């Protein structure tokens, strides 16, 4: 995540890493945890173009 | 964590376990605490989230 920028790297699962960034813009966690497949599909289809 | 068919999410912190117990803590320092109904909020049923766990949540004073 951002823990390796200052100090030593600390492991964290990716899905729990995205919740931090969602909370960082105003939305809540259950929004991400309840729409995981749709978000993953959107990211894949967006980066495949 | 699932308790009584409902899903509970943390308010400010993460869920951790030392092998036999579950606590809450802040993300930058180690300071465990016992899960209650004051540092969590509830939303939805218990068949959507991936990786949910079965545990118990303690009512602070209202019923005790």
Query: What resolution (Å)?
Result: 3.1
Beta bridge partners, B42, equal B8
Structural gaps in chain B: residues followed by a C–N separation over 2.5 Å: none
Whether B36 and B58 have beta carbons less than 8 Å apart is answered as yes
Distance (Å, whole) CA B3 – CA B52: 10
Count CB-CB contacts under 10 A for residue A2: 8
Distance (Å, whole) CA B11 – CA B24: 10
Count CB-CB contacts under 10 A for residue B38: 11
Q: Among B14, B43, B50, whose Cβ lies nearest the Cβ of A30? A: B43
- Our separate counts of H helices and E strands in chain B read 0, 5
Nearest CA in chain A to B44: A30
Whether B35 and B22 have beta carbons less than 8 Å apart is answered as yes
How was this one solved? cryo-EM
Put simply, whether B61 touches A (Cβ < 8 Å) is no
Strands (E), chain B: 8-10, 14-17, 22-25, 33-34, 40-42
Give the closest-approach CA distance of B61 to chain A in angstroms. Answer: 27
Q: What is the CA radius of gyration of chain A?
A: 13
């Amino acid at each position: 995540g951002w823990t390796f920028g200052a100090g030593a790297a600390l492991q964290i699962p990716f899905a729990m890493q995205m919740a931090y960034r969602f909370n960082g813009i105003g939305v809540t966690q259950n929004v991400l945890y309840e729409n995981q497949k749709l978000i993953a599909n959107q990211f894949n289809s967006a980066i495949g173009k | 964590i699932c308790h009584d068919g409902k899903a509970h999410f943390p308010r400010e912190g993460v869920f951790v376990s030392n092998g036999t117990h579950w606590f809450v803590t802040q993300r930058n320092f180690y300071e465990p605490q016992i899960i209650t109904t004051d540092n969590t909020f509830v939303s939805g049923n218990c068949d959507v989230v991936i990786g949910i766990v079965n545990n118990t949540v303690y009512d602070p004073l209202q019923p005790e």
